[PDB]
Amino acid sequence: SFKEELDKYF
């Protein structure tokens, strides 16, 4: 999910 993409990104 794009939520998980942001979690990794952050």
């Epitope: 939520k3 942001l6 952050f10």
Partner: antibody
Framework: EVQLQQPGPVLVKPGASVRMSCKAS????????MNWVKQSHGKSLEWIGI????????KYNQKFKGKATLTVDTSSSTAYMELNSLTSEDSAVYYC???????????????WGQGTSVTVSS | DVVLTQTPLSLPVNIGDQASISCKST?????????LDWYLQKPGQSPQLLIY???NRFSGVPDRFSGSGSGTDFTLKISRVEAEDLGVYYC????????FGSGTKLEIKR
Amino acid sequence: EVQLQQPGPVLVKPGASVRMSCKASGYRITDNFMNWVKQSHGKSLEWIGIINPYNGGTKYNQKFKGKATLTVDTSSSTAYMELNSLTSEDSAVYYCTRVRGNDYHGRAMDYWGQGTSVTVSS
Amino acid sequence: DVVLTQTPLSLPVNIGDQASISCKSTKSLLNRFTFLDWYLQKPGQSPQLLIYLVSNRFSGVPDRFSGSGSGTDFTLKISRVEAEDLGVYYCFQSNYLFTFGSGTKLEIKR
């Protein structure tokens, strides 16, 4: 004190590109993420993208991929946004913001530049 | 995109009265930590942070401003409204693609 310094209003031609800048003062630019935000007619706020100034890594609002490109120059503590293929829909105020970080800080936007008001006109 | 529906979008209040803005989201903003913020834009200024992490007051912000809620439902309350509190209030999420609410225009009725 922390300050985000953006240039004042600019006039650019339709079809051209424009690169706008955001100079960070009072902190190390690589210690924090940065968001860029578009405000149309003083009303609607819209997230453009986020950049990690230490990595250069970016994430974009889908509507702005291919339209906006975020970059940083760490040696001059300056963030940049370039908009391409300009149209009258791109006339807006563009804000650069400092993002506190993840978790306890809430990914919140704690310091804001004064914005660059872009007029797209021939 | 997750939509943040604010109600009301227009909010007349007497000075000294309580103002309440609802922000409803189509998807839960819980991250595990809930990323819901409140921003204010006063006429002619940049947006400024009021509340982060649903309920934490940012520095220099008076305690008349309070945030609450969980999952998809959230509230910003101004306990005793002052003249200088006029502006547009925005909720903002960063659990998914960052989105803002449409903004609530707080006007002073007199």
